[PDB]
Amino acid sequence: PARDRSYAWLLSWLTRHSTRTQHLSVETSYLQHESGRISTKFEFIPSPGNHFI
Amino acid sequence: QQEEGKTVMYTAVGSEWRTFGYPRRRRPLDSVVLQQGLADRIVKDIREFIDNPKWYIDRGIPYRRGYLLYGPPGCGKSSFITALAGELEHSICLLSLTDSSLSDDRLNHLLSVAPQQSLVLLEDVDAAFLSRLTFSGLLNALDGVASTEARIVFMTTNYIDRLDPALIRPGRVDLKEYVGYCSHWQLTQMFQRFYPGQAPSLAENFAEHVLKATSEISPAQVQGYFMLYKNDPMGAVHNIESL
Amino acid sequence: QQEEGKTVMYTAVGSEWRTFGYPRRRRPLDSVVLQQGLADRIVKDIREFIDNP
Amino acid sequence: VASTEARIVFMTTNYIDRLDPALIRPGRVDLKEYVGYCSHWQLTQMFQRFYPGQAPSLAENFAEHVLKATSEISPAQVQGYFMLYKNDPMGAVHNIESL
């Protein structure tokens, strides 16, 4: 389930293992520290649906 | 692209760093002209210190570096510090150590609790170093805990004689630079900056005329003179002999 | 693997332990060289004390 | 009271004479160790660590030179000297006699 922390770990492992996943979903990490230094990074996870690995 | 960065200067009340006022616009680095290559050298040294954290941690040395800027008043030291902090997207932590409100313990605590990604500026260092009031306590606090990481500290003095050679040492003040009175290149670059587009020969003649007229002319005085003849380069050039 | 550990040094004010500053990076053990085998002896003694409650 | 569990306590002193033998006792200070001035192995390992990859014979000569020059050299002084010649091993080796 989503509540368990293994959800994100498994999604990251899937996107690291199956590099050629045509269908994907995005996860943007956005944090504005003090002095207004904006840090952004795009993390991709398998999109909702059925995937075969 | 739609966001313009700002520099937030932090002030210290009691024993805590507080946001002094509201965020301010970033002054362009090239606006503050120091010398032939002093700005380039300082920027390169800071970039090397920041972009290579592996070197310090692997060798077991604190990731702390400090610079000292000494020169006549009005030479553009604090303006250069602000421009550098804006360039590096850091935040300024202004601290007037000449004030007697803070003691050795308070100074050490303030330097230890400084915000991350922030430059700490200690102005009037010569004043209290002559004389809560302490001179050895300041250097003892400087060699304390080096914050979380990259405790870049800037200290400015009108003269370096009142200080001691012990201040200049690795693990302490690292790169001392002297910012002084304007030169020919300084004056011509200032004339080109304040007035956006004129005859370069006119700027050179202006610089030579001020160099002849005054020997210890400060950039602050140059800016003040330029304010008298705002949007009037020919009049300012004709009025150099008046100065 | 994406997380780097940190050492938090606690200071004491009044009669309570407080977090002094922010977490700091872990200095490598081999960076501090003490003697021929003093570090090894101390590490082994601490490991024996900890792993045998 | 020994805390919740595993109350590991570390105590450091510049000298042990000012203390008393009562401090060293089971249920108290358990393993006392003396960390002193650098040795040949200490100096060569420091030289190998600070400068990542040079001649081991050069490190040995460096260690011998500092051992000859000073008898009570401290590792903090060694680090301070290395800071003077950062990314400059040959210059530091040539400047040992200066120390």
Ligand SMILES: Nc1ncnc2c1ncn2[C@@H]1O[C@H](COP(=O)(O)OP(=O)(O)O)[C@@H](O)[C@H]1O
């Ligand atoms: N080297 C320089 N280049 C451009 N402007 C300068 C320079 N030095 C001083 N000024 C101008 O002079 C004014 C006064 O500067 P000042 O506050 O006296 O600097 P500091 O206190 O660091 O000497 C500032 O508004 C600044 O724009």
